[PDB]
Subunit: 112 residues, 3 copies
Amino acid sequence: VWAIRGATTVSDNTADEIVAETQKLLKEMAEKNGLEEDDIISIIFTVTKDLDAAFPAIAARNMGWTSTALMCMNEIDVPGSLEKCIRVMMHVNTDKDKKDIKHVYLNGAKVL
Amino acid sequence: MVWAIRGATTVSDNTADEIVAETQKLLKEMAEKNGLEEDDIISIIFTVTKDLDAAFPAIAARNMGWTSTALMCMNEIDVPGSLEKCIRVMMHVNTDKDKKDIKHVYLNGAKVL
Amino acid sequence: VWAIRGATTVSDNTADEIVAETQKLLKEMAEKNGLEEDDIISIIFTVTKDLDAAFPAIAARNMGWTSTALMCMNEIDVPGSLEKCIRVMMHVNTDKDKKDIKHVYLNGAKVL
């Protein structure tokens, strides 16, 4: 049982971009760590307050991840912080060591 | 070993009695359908939608004697037009059931989710 | 896998106060439970909405927890509750049984 972090950005506050950018992040998180849905314990999503167009969880439902516990919140509101940012915390049952976990930072979130 | 259980429910009013009682029924339901006692529960994360502020849903767990469990409460992601008056619960548990056997619980207006 | 709760308060909404008080809470959670970073699965931080000066997760980085999954949100907005409050939820891999986990309440958070 370890936890994996993801982050990415969107250009615009639209449903399709929030969903598309999230799905890409979830897809990369799974591939890089060799995961399938039944390895995954839970997925927590946050968006910054400037995003309100859609639940990022839609992306997991698109992928067919309908048996996994999901939760969507807003990121802590810190003036001056990275805008238009979606973050993921995924708890996983895995045979890998914590040192070998691969956290995914995409698009504007590469600044962390 | 470790899996997570989701619950959701709705209330009629933004009041402390409704929030706490509907959260309590949801937790009881979640524990029953998954055969859980407090010993089995790792953590409980609560969210409420923006229209609910009258109390902490975490009081429900304390009422029913879950006084040794890590709790946390946030607001749900703000998305205008989403289900209103909604309490969600994410419960991490130690269990011998398979992921596919876990029963997630949707009550009241939350059945639509 | 058990979860550990922490809470503390700050005197002011500043980056120094938020980081310093969170760092003190994390350190006391780690010592009272005999943890190194290798034992920590994830840390979730919340702040009451009157605080916005900094990410509490900076404190985890300052203690060298650079390989741990971190996430920050605001606390549920409930009028009539403790303000200037930082809360922590920590999932850990441990041999200690649930009843032997020590939860830590500091400063104005002792009220809780």
